[PDB]
């Protein structure tokens, strides 16, 4: 279950290994717009929070 619209369920991801390929298990991807960074280079990057 997901939350409502006015009260979103914010979560903070702590230190871990992030694989930006498991999310591709979802097929449709009606929109995958990435603004700050290019999606292709999403794997070869490191983030603070």
């Amino acid at each position: 279950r997901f939350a409502s619209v006015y009260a979103w369920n914010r979560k903070r991801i702590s230190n871990c290994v992030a694989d930006y390929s498991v999310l591709y298990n979802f097929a449709p991807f009606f929109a995958f717009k990435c603004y700050g960074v290019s999606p292709t280079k999403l794997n070869d990057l490191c983030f603070t929070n």
Binding site: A27, F32, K33, T40
Partner: protein, 98 residues
């Protein structure tokens, strides 16, 4: 002068433009960012449709890599998804691209 003619649905007619992403604009036909020319679209439902329907037209939905501009990708290659190395099974986790 080059002319490319084909048929699409209305909801994606806005998708044929430089610097735009989606399903038709990424898996079927991508224009260059510095493209020059014109685009024309007209309605053809009344004389290009059947009561039972027409299944002649198919569009690609899954592709391994992004399509470079002006590159036809006619290839009946079974999609590889999941962890099962399909060898032509065309079943679960291996979809029909078109």
């Amino acid at each position: 002068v080059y002319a490319d003619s084909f048929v699409i649905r209305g909801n994606e007619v806005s998708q044929i433009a430089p610097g735009q992403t989606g399903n038709i604009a990424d898996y079927n036909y991508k224009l260059p960012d510095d493209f020059t020319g014109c685009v024309i679209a007209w309605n053809s439902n009344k004389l290009d449709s059947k009561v039972s329907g027409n299944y002649n037209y198919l569009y690609r939905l899954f592709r391994k890599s992004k399509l470079k501009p002006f590159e036809r990708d006619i290839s009946t290659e079974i999609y590889q998804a999941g962890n099962k190395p399909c060898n032509g099974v065309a079943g679960f986790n291996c979809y029909f691209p078109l």
